Ligand binder design. Sequence first.
Ligand code: MG
Lengths: 50, 50, 49, 119, 38, 50
Amino acid sequence: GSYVNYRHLALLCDTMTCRGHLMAITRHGVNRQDTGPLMKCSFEETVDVL
Amino acid sequence: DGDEMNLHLPQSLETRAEIQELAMVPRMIVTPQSNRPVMGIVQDTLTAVR
Amino acid sequence: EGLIDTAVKTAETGYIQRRLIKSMESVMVKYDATVRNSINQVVQLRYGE
Amino acid sequence: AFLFRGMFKNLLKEVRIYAQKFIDRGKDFNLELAIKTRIISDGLKYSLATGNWGDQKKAHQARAGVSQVLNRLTFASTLSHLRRLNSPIGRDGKLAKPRQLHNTLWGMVCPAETPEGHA
Amino acid sequence: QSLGEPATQMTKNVTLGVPRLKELINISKKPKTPSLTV
Amino acid sequence: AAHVIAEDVKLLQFHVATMVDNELPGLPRAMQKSGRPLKSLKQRLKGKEG
DNA sequence: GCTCCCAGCTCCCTGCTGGCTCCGAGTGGGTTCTGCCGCTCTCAATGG
RNA sequence: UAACCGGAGAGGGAACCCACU
DNA sequence: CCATTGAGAGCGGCGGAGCCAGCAGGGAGCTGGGAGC
Ligand SMILES: [Mg+2]
């Protein structure tokens, strides 16, 4: 019964499908994105990426 | 009923002014998540106003 | 059942919200009025369409 | 009696080596000095003090909290701490069926007194 | 925050709730109840 | 002795590697002679509370 | 010796399983836990 | 034609159960 | 003054769920040696 604005669902479904494949919201989806190592070491794995 | 809240104190004029212009409590009444107030009248006062 | 589900709820949803923020924290609205991320790839052309 | 078996095997491993270093000189061996008293007296006192149900050399491999400090805060917490059971299932368990109140705990286990945390 | 804050108050068969939010977030190849609506 | 050098370096390898990674799969963890394993450099920054 | 047939060969992909990582914020208090034996060098007490 | 004193952030680590929202 | 040596003290030892890597089992189709000229 609750309601979330639409802006916030469009934005999540846009980041998930923005690079042409399905980017999961796990460590295998967002760490394979090329964001730069100091940002990936903060989510998970923390040294494997460094 | 035993809840505890923390209290941070901004330590500069430039952080004080920023909190005062961006996070003060009457500025936060309407949420952008569902575009409705987050604060309402809710106990004893709501029963007595009815 | 309600006491069991409260105690598993608390720890299972707090991890969804963390995975979401790490995946989207740097998406913001530029002065271009377009919605980009840290690599400046354009995510939405206008906020919320 | 799970402890006192391992602690009684360690001291037969001690009186063994002590009979050994002593018959091989061909001298004769004495046991008063072979009986290491600090095997029982300290293994018991150790596991009953930390709670780890094992030896001190392998204590990260043991059970834990088998032995807790009695709660003297009101008489009803003393009395309930002494009659407390424990299902050893780990935490970080997303399963429910061991946390549900089974029909079969009727009259045996109190159906109302449980901790409301993760245990 | 707007998708995680309501998520904390949620719970033939369609596995709604956080078990479903987790299948959508982690694009999972084997979901629990994969139906069609023909 | 051209044979012991092999064991010397095998143990040097064990030490220099468990300095930077104490958890190895299928390898004895370097413990202190109190009986507790070490906190390698990878553990100082591995997970939560890194 | 010529042209052309065929199994063995060569590489291709598809599929199962082992290995690795993660598992909510914060807070208070508590109690237990910094390796243990022993074999040589040194000191200055105490024997002649 | 006279009159006694002067120094200052100290400081500690590892592990476990119980409890609170 | 002379002196072997106990004692002091210090250092050398003695749970569960989900992605990628590896492998094995398995076809397309090439090329040398045979087949018929
Ligand atoms: Mg409350």
